[PDB]
Protein backbone atom coordinates (compact mmCIF):
# COMPACT_ATOMS: atom_id res chain seq x y z
CA UNK A 1 0.00 0.00 0.00
CA UNK A 2 1.01 3.27 -0.85
CA UNK A 3 0.09 6.19 1.66
CA UNK A 4 -1.76 9.16 0.03
CA UNK A 5 0.23 11.79 2.63
CA UNK A 6 2.26 11.70 6.06
CA UNK A 7 -0.13 9.61 8.38
CA UNK A 8 0.23 6.30 9.35
CA UNK A 9 -1.73 3.68 11.66
CA UNK A 10 -0.19 3.58 14.90
CA UNK A 11 -0.74 -0.50 15.51
CA UNK A 12 -1.59 -2.20 17.54
CA UNK A 13 -4.74 -1.85 18.58
CA UNK A 14 -5.94 -2.72 21.82
CA UNK A 15 -8.39 -5.31 22.17
CA UNK A 16 -11.43 -4.68 21.61
CA UNK A 17 -13.93 -3.27 24.19
CA UNK A 18 -16.74 -4.34 26.13
CA UNK A 19 -20.06 -3.09 26.37
CA UNK A 20 -21.68 -4.31 30.13
CA UNK A 21 -24.36 -6.89 29.14
CA UNK A 22 -27.39 -4.50 30.86
CA UNK A 23 -26.85 -1.61 27.52
CA UNK A 24 -28.95 -3.13 25.30
CA UNK A 25 -27.40 -3.98 21.72
CA UNK A 26 -28.22 -3.27 18.31
CA UNK A 27 -28.71 -5.94 15.87
CA UNK A 28 -25.26 -5.74 14.49
CA UNK A 29 -23.15 -5.77 17.69
CA UNK A 30 -23.53 -9.62 17.56
CA UNK A 31 -23.42 -10.52 14.17
CA UNK A 32 -19.76 -12.09 13.56
CA UNK A 33 -19.23 -10.02 10.50
CA UNK A 34 -21.31 -6.89 12.14
CA UNK A 35 -23.98 -7.07 9.76
CA UNK A 36 -27.12 -5.53 10.40
CA UNK A 37 -30.11 -7.66 9.14
CA UNK A 38 -32.86 -4.68 10.12
CA UNK A 39 -30.59 -2.15 7.10
CA UNK A 40 -30.25 -4.95 5.13
CA UNK A 41 -33.91 -5.96 4.84
CA UNK A 42 -33.98 -2.14 3.92
CA UNK A 43 -31.02 -1.90 1.37
CA UNK A 44 -32.29 -0.19 -2.00
CA UNK A 45 -35.78 0.85 -1.15
CA UNK A 46 -36.59 4.74 -1.18
CA UNK A 47 -39.02 5.11 1.15
CA UNK A 48 -38.63 7.23 4.22
CA UNK A 49 -40.24 6.80 7.93
CA UNK A 50 -42.08 9.35 8.80
CA UNK A 51 -41.43 8.88 13.12
CA UNK A 52 -44.15 8.80 15.58
CA UNK A 53 -44.31 11.17 18.12
CA UNK A 54 -42.54 7.86 20.64
CA UNK A 55 -39.73 7.89 18.16
CA UNK A 56 -39.41 11.54 18.47
CA UNK A 57 -39.01 11.36 21.65
CA UNK A 58 -36.44 8.74 21.60
CA UNK A 59 -34.32 10.52 18.91
CA UNK A 60 -34.24 13.46 21.10
CA UNK A 61 -33.17 11.75 24.14
CA UNK A 62 -30.32 9.62 22.07
CA UNK A 63 -29.02 12.45 20.22
CA UNK A 64 -29.22 15.13 23.17
CA UNK A 65 -26.98 12.09 24.85
CA UNK A 66 -24.79 12.16 22.05
CA UNK A 67 -23.79 15.79 22.00
CA UNK A 68 -22.90 15.43 25.55
CA UNK A 69 -20.23 12.68 24.47
CA UNK A 70 -18.55 14.36 21.68
CA UNK A 71 -18.53 17.57 24.34
CA UNK A 72 -16.43 15.09 26.34
CA UNK A 73 -13.83 14.33 23.39
CA UNK A 74 -13.78 17.99 22.29
CA UNK A 75 -12.36 18.60 26.15
CA UNK A 76 -10.00 15.90 25.64
CA UNK A 77 -8.04 17.29 22.47
CA UNK A 78 -4.80 18.88 23.29
CA UNK A 79 -1.25 17.64 21.88
CA UNK A 80 -0.03 14.41 22.54
CA UNK A 81 -3.27 12.56 23.63
CA UNK A 82 -3.85 9.48 21.16
CA UNK A 83 -6.66 8.84 19.35
CA UNK A 84 -7.23 5.70 21.81
CA UNK A 85 -7.16 7.49 24.57
CA UNK A 86 -10.42 9.83 22.96
CA UNK A 87 -11.46 6.15 21.81
CA UNK A 88 -11.53 5.35 25.51
CA UNK A 89 -13.29 8.48 27.58
CA UNK A 90 -16.01 7.96 24.45
CA UNK A 91 -16.77 4.35 25.13
CA UNK A 92 -16.74 5.04 28.88
CA UNK A 93 -19.05 7.85 28.50
CA UNK A 94 -21.55 6.38 26.05
CA UNK A 95 -21.64 3.09 29.10
CA UNK A 96 -22.25 5.95 31.71
CA UNK A 97 -25.11 7.49 29.94
CA UNK A 98 -26.72 3.56 29.34
CA UNK A 99 -25.86 3.45 25.95
CA UNK A 100 -24.22 0.84 23.19
CA UNK A 101 -21.48 2.93 21.20
CA UNK A 102 -23.09 2.42 17.26
CA UNK A 103 -19.94 2.32 15.45
CA UNK A 104 -18.48 -0.85 17.30
CA UNK A 105 -18.84 -3.61 15.52
CA UNK A 106 -20.42 -2.12 13.33
CA UNK A 107 -19.78 -4.25 9.93
CA UNK A 108 -16.69 -5.43 12.22
CA UNK A 109 -15.62 -1.58 12.79
CA UNK A 110 -13.01 -2.12 15.64
CA UNK A 111 -13.72 1.29 17.69
CA UNK A 112 -16.31 3.40 19.67
CA UNK A 113 -15.90 6.52 17.53
CA UNK A 114 -14.33 7.34 14.36
CA UNK A 115 -11.01 9.82 14.53
CA UNK A 116 -10.16 11.55 11.46
CA UNK A 117 -6.98 13.22 11.28
CA UNK A 118 -6.06 15.43 8.30
CA UNK A 119 -6.21 13.74 5.21
CA UNK A 120 -8.60 10.82 6.60
CA UNK A 121 -12.11 12.13 4.87
CA UNK A 122 -13.79 9.57 7.70
CA UNK A 123 -14.45 6.30 8.98
CA UNK A 124 -10.34 6.63 11.05
CA UNK A 125 -9.80 4.20 13.33
CA UNK A 126 -8.65 5.26 16.75
CA UNK A 127 -4.93 4.29 17.32
CA UNK A 128 -1.58 4.43 19.31
CA UNK A 129 -1.03 7.80 17.34
CA UNK A 130 -0.66 10.88 19.43
CA UNK A 131 -2.39 13.78 18.07
CA UNK A 132 0.44 16.30 16.60
CA UNK A 133 -0.22 20.30 17.07
CA UNK A 134 -1.31 21.47 13.85
CA UNK A 135 -3.37 18.73 13.37
CA UNK A 136 -7.26 18.83 12.64
CA UNK A 137 -8.91 16.25 13.91
CA UNK A 138 -13.05 15.15 13.36
CA UNK A 139 -14.33 12.76 16.09
CA UNK A 140 -17.85 11.15 14.74
CA UNK A 141 -20.02 10.39 17.86
CA UNK A 142 -23.17 7.20 17.55
CA UNK A 143 -25.02 6.67 20.34
CA UNK A 144 -27.83 3.72 20.54
CA UNK A 145 -30.67 4.11 23.40
CA UNK A 146 -34.12 2.44 23.12
CA UNK A 147 -33.46 1.45 19.83
CA UNK A 148 -32.76 4.66 18.34
CA UNK A 149 -29.64 5.81 16.74
CA UNK A 150 -28.08 10.04 17.07
CA UNK A 151 -25.32 10.54 15.10
CA UNK A 152 -23.19 13.94 15.06
CA UNK A 153 -19.57 15.37 14.79
CA UNK A 154 -17.17 18.08 14.78
CA UNK A 155 -13.73 18.58 13.74
CA UNK A 156 -11.49 20.35 16.41
CA UNK A 157 -7.80 21.90 16.12
CA UNK A 158 -5.21 20.45 17.56
CA UNK A 159 -3.32 23.48 19.30
CA UNK A 160 -1.96 26.34 16.81
CA UNK A 161 -3.54 25.34 13.58
CA UNK A 162 -2.85 26.82 10.16
CA UNK A 163 -4.72 29.61 8.05
CA UNK A 164 -5.69 27.00 5.51
CA UNK A 165 -6.41 24.69 8.49
CA UNK A 166 -8.79 27.60 9.64
CA UNK A 167 -10.44 28.49 6.35
CA UNK A 168 -11.17 24.76 5.71
CA UNK A 169 -13.03 23.92 8.84
CA UNK A 170 -14.57 27.45 8.99
CA UNK A 171 -15.99 26.72 5.47
CA UNK A 172 -17.14 23.14 6.19
CA UNK A 173 -18.95 24.13 9.35
CA UNK A 174 -20.68 27.13 7.18
CA UNK A 175 -21.44 24.19 4.13
CA UNK A 176 -23.60 22.13 7.21
CA UNK A 177 -25.50 25.57 8.24
CA UNK A 178 -26.18 26.67 5.12
CA UNK A 179 -27.73 23.30 4.49
CA UNK A 180 -30.17 22.87 7.71
CA UNK A 181 -31.23 26.27 7.16
CA UNK A 182 -32.59 24.94 3.80
CA UNK A 183 -34.30 22.01 5.52
CA UNK A 184 -38.19 22.22 6.04
CA UNK A 185 -41.26 20.14 4.72
CA UNK A 186 -41.13 20.24 0.53
CA UNK A 187 -37.33 20.84 0.18
CA UNK A 188 -35.87 18.07 -2.44
CA UNK A 189 -33.07 16.02 -0.48
CA UNK A 190 -31.15 16.87 -3.84
CA UNK A 191 -31.08 20.41 -2.90
CA UNK A 192 -28.64 20.29 -0.08
CA UNK A 193 -25.56 19.50 -1.99
CA UNK A 194 -26.31 21.91 -4.31
CA UNK A 195 -25.75 24.22 -1.62
CA UNK A 196 -22.98 23.03 0.02
CA UNK A 197 -20.96 22.65 -3.09
CA UNK A 198 -21.43 26.42 -4.38
CA UNK A 199 -20.00 27.35 -0.82
CA UNK A 200 -17.40 25.04 -0.76
CA UNK A 201 -16.52 26.08 -4.59
CA UNK A 202 -16.57 29.54 -3.89
CA UNK A 203 -13.70 28.53 -1.56
CA UNK A 204 -11.41 26.71 -3.52
CA UNK A 205 -12.39 23.59 -1.76
CA UNK A 206 -13.94 20.44 -3.23
CA UNK A 207 -16.86 17.69 -1.88
CA UNK A 208 -16.31 14.42 -0.96
CA UNK A 209 -18.86 12.14 -3.51
CA UNK A 210 -18.43 8.53 -1.64
CA UNK A 211 -19.98 9.34 1.59
CA UNK A 212 -23.55 10.49 2.10
CA UNK A 213 -25.45 11.10 5.02
CA UNK A 214 -28.45 9.39 5.51
CA UNK A 215 -31.73 8.75 7.35
CA UNK A 216 -31.53 7.47 11.00
CA UNK A 217 -33.44 6.58 13.96
CA UNK A 218 -34.25 2.44 14.85
CA UNK A 219 -31.38 1.63 12.09
CA UNK A 220 -27.77 3.32 12.25
CA UNK A 221 -28.02 3.82 7.85
CA UNK A 222 -31.23 4.20 6.15
CA UNK A 223 -32.91 6.23 3.41
CA UNK A 224 -32.76 9.11 2.86
CA UNK A 225 -29.36 9.29 0.77
CA UNK A 226 -28.58 12.49 1.21
CA UNK A 227 -25.16 13.41 -1.41
CA UNK A 228 -23.19 17.00 -0.46
CA UNK A 229 -22.71 17.63 -4.02
CA UNK A 230 -24.14 19.66 -6.65
CA UNK A 231 -26.46 17.81 -9.37
CA UNK A 232 -27.31 15.08 -7.72
CA UNK A 233 -30.07 12.50 -8.30
CA UNK A 234 -31.11 11.64 -4.49
CA UNK A 235 -34.56 10.74 -4.29
CA UNK A 236 -37.29 12.02 -2.03
CA UNK A 237 -38.94 14.94 -0.53
CA UNK A 238 -38.86 16.54 3.25
CA UNK A 239 -41.82 15.79 5.03
CA UNK A 240 -42.46 16.72 8.92
CA UNK A 241 -41.20 13.97 10.85
CA UNK A 242 -38.60 12.70 8.92
CA UNK A 243 -34.82 12.54 10.64
CA UNK A 244 -31.38 12.24 8.47
CA UNK A 245 -28.34 13.15 8.47
CA UNK A 246 -25.90 15.99 6.92
CA UNK A 247 -22.68 15.32 7.21
CA UNK A 248 -20.41 17.14 4.67
CA UNK A 249 -16.38 16.38 3.99
CA UNK A 250 -14.95 19.06 2.07
CA UNK A 251 -11.16 19.01 0.94
CA UNK A 252 -8.38 21.56 0.30
CA UNK A 253 -7.58 19.55 -3.28
CA UNK A 254 -9.23 17.56 -4.96
CA UNK A 255 -12.55 15.57 -3.66
CA UNK A 256 -11.39 11.43 -4.71
CA UNK A 257 -10.92 9.16 -1.84
CA UNK A 258 -9.48 6.05 -1.25
CA UNK A 259 -9.67 3.29 1.58
CA UNK A 260 -6.82 2.16 3.70
CA UNK A 261 -5.76 -1.66 3.67
CA UNK A 262 -7.90 -1.41 7.15
CA UNK A 263 -11.00 -1.18 4.90
CA UNK A 264 -12.62 1.47 6.97
CA UNK A 265 -9.96 4.60 6.71
CA UNK A 266 -10.91 6.87 3.75
CA UNK A 267 -8.57 9.45 2.67
CA UNK A 268 -7.53 11.87 -0.15
CA UNK A 269 -6.10 10.61 -3.11
CA UNK A 270 -3.74 13.56 -3.31
CA UNK A 271 -3.08 13.54 0.85
CA UNK A 272 -4.97 17.23 1.11
CA UNK A 273 -6.48 17.83 4.75
CA UNK A 274 -10.44 17.13 4.92
CA UNK A 275 -12.79 18.05 7.45
CA UNK A 276 -16.47 17.89 8.11
CA UNK A 277 -19.44 18.16 10.45
CA UNK A 278 -22.48 16.87 11.05
CA UNK A 279 -25.76 16.68 12.73
CA UNK A 280 -28.60 14.38 12.95
CA UNK A 281 -32.40 17.03 12.05
CA UNK A 282 -35.79 16.35 12.29
CA UNK A 283 -37.98 18.03 9.74
CA UNK A 284 -40.89 19.93 11.35
CA UNK A 285 -43.84 21.32 10.05
CA UNK A 286 -42.26 24.24 9.54
CA UNK A 287 -38.57 24.16 9.36
CA UNK A 288 -36.31 21.41 11.33
CA UNK A 289 -35.06 20.48 14.83
CA UNK A 290 -31.25 20.20 15.39
CA UNK A 291 -31.40 17.35 17.49
CA UNK A 292 -27.25 16.84 18.02
CA UNK A 293 -27.22 20.86 18.62
CA UNK A 294 -25.53 22.50 21.81
CA UNK A 295 -27.66 23.13 24.37
CA UNK A 296 -25.88 25.07 26.31
CA UNK A 297 -23.10 26.78 24.06
CA UNK A 298 -23.71 29.22 20.86
CA UNK A 299 -20.79 27.79 18.28
CA UNK A 300 -18.99 24.74 17.85
CA UNK A 301 -15.96 24.08 19.73
CA UNK A 302 -13.44 25.11 17.15
CA UNK A 303 -15.27 28.62 17.77
CA UNK A 304 -14.84 28.35 21.59
C1 LIG B 1 -17.84 3.15 11.63
S1 LIG B 1 -19.55 3.62 11.43
C2 LIG B 1 -19.44 5.44 11.60
C3 LIG B 1 -20.52 6.14 10.79
C4 LIG B 1 -20.60 7.65 10.96
N1 LIG B 1 -20.92 8.01 12.37
C5 LIG B 1 -21.69 8.27 10.12
O1 LIG B 1 -22.10 9.46 10.39
O2 LIG B 1 -22.25 7.57 9.22
CO1 LIG C 1 -21.43 10.18 12.19
CO1 LIG D 1 -23.84 9.98 9.89
K1 LIG E 1 -9.66 15.01 8.38
Redesign the pocket.
Known sequence: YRYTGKLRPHYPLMPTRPVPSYIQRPDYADHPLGMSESEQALKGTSQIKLLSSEDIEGMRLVCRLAREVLDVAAGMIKPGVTTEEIDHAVHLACIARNCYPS?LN?YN?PKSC?TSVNEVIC?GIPDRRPLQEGDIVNV?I?LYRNGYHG?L?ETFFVGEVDDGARKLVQTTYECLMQAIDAVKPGVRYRELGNIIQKHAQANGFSVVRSYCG?GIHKLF?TAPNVPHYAKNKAVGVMKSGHVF?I?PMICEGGWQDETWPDGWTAVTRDGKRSAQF?HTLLVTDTGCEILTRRLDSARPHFMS
Request: net charge negative; hydrophobic share 5%.
Open positions: PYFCHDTDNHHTEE
